[PDB]
Amino acid sequence: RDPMKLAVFTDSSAYLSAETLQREDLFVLDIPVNIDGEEYVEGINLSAEEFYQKMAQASELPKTSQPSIAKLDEILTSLKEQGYTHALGLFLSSGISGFYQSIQYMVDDYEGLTIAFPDTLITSAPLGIMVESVFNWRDQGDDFASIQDKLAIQISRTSAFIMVDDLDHLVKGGRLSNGAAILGNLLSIKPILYFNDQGVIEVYEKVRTEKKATKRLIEIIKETTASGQYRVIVIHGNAPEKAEELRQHLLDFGLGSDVSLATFGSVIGTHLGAGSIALGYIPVI
Ligand SMILES: CCCCCCCCCCCCCC(=O)O
């Protein structure tokens, strides 16, 4: 491996594989979720499996907070003092959190520590695979500049396509424009949303029904992944039967172990609400 002494950061909106969660020098900044005046951190005092029902019994909509910039600063200061030479931070999209813009002033603040915080434009399982890939590339002997190049390609060719049971959480949480709600009919319509090339959640297509929207997610992913080898992830929030159906369609298309399943927990589920489904994709670089 390269003789840099590298630290990798992400936040808990990333869906991290068991592989990645074992890796050295990985720092995950937790995102707290306020429910009825109490602060929860998934994996500490909140399990992902209790979240949707807990939210349904809440007296106001839960609210997420940004990853802690104070803890990022303290960790970076510490890593500098312990002789680390490089830090890579892969955080949730600038289009869904002010955290990315807030940390841009820190990049040059730590003498002797080379820092990069590229805008990943994504979250959830694709973000987690970016983190995984960083370690894979390190294991190939890649240095810091080569890792950044490879990340830049992944970022440019990654997105996710999303359908929610109801647009209320997204609009009320602020990550989807207010207009989008009147954009479209009512209960029945199931718009497909995606991460656009600015990392912002945008309406892709207004679909009339859930059954069609399910098919359309598959058809869109067949198109967007046609050039090369991609990881495709079926991601759901309390929608396991729909997720398994989609996974079966992708396996029948031939995706094999390149298709996997993940879940939306408390952080993303606060914004998407229960009953949500997404297909994420990211090239294997
Ligand atoms: C793959 C689909 C992902 C959908 C993401 C919905 C929006 C999540 C925003 C989470 C913000 C957490 C940190 C914050 O509050 O600033």
Ligand code: NA
């Ligand atoms: Na392909």
